[PDB]
């Protein structure tokens, strides 16, 4: 999930947008 | 923009910045 995606490895602001409503 | 490690409350702050008025869901596994 978002935690594996952004915390454990790295992620972009664009990937974070996937979690906007 | 850049990639980075975002953990804990920092991840949620980033979601707030990116999504803003759209709202978002934070659902850890
Ligand atoms: Cl910290
Ligand atoms: Zn901190």
Swiss-Prot record, chain A:
<feature type="disulfide bond">
    <location>
        <begin position="6"/>
        <end position="11"/>
    </location>
</feature>
<protein>
    <recommendedName>
        <fullName>Insulin A chain</fullName>
    </recommendedName>
</protein>
